[PDB]
Design a protein around this nucleic acid. Structure first.
Ligand code: HMU
Length: 196
DNA sequence: CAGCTCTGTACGTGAGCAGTGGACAGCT
DNA sequence: AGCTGTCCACTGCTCAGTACAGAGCTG
């Protein structure tokens, strides 16, 4: 029990999006974990690498935590949402129909607020997104920038290893910070390309 | 064959948990 | 000196996607 709160109550709770217009980066998670539904803030996981990586990469220049997520769009130009809204312990608990439904809601949200870069916090969710939205399944899907903008916009697609610490192939935040740094570089290259 | 899809399986860190016990002050 | 309770350092866990092999297919 999370301070008295049963796991049953948490499964029903949802995590509110934090979206505005003219954002640079929208961090797209998979779906709310237990701690996320409890706190009502994005990536509150004590082990989760998201915030540490936001700092080590200098995307935030100050060590923030989940409580500051609502202050991100104004200050740092970063917004939050997920592929699937339903709260589950994580990943494998969701169905294919749920993910693709989420993708529809997601691609819809993306072409509304249209940020500069749609950041997929997880390879898995982009595999589903790419196949559904772009009708394309590539043998060797790689991290980083993707060949397709979300339809009818100029929003780019950028994929990173999931900030979850369950990922054994990237054991530490140091092992993931590289993709955040190139995300920051991508952002800067886009701001400059526009300012020209 | 060879390719394609889907399922299951295995894998490293480090934060936080309960349990354990050593240090130690306040007693009698 | 012996007793004893609290405190706390430290223990030994557990647990928060991805790559890939192979099986069941199809071409
Ligand atoms: O990739 C991720 N990691 C963690 C979460 C939530 O805790 C999420 O939604 N997506």
């Amino acid at each position: 029990s999370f301070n008295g709160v049963s796991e049953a109550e948490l499964l029903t709770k949802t995590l509110p999006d934090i979206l505005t217009f003219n954002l640079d980066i929208v961090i797209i998670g998979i779906n709310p974990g237990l701690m996320a539904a409890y706190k009502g803030h994005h990536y509150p996981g004590p082990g989760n690498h998201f915030w540490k990586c936001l700092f080590m990469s200098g995307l935030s220049e100050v060590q923030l935590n989940h409580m500051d997520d609502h202050t991100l769009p104004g200050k740092y130009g970063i917004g939050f949402t997920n592929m699937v809204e339903r709260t589950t312990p994580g990943s494998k608990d969701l169905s294919s129909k749920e993910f693709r439904e989420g993708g529809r809601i997601l691609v819809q949200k993306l072409q509304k607020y249209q940020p500069r870069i749609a950041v997929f916090n997880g390879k898995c969710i982009y595999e589903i997104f790419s196949k559904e939205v772009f009708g394309v399944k590539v043998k060797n899907l790689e991290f980083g920038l993707q060949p397709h903008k979300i339809p009818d916009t100029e929003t780019l697609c950028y994929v990173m290893p999931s900030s979850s610490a369950r990922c054994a192939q990237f054991p530490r935040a140091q092992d993931k910070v590289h993709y955040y740094i190139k995300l920051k570089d991508l952002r800067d290259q886009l701001k400059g390309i526009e300012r020209n």
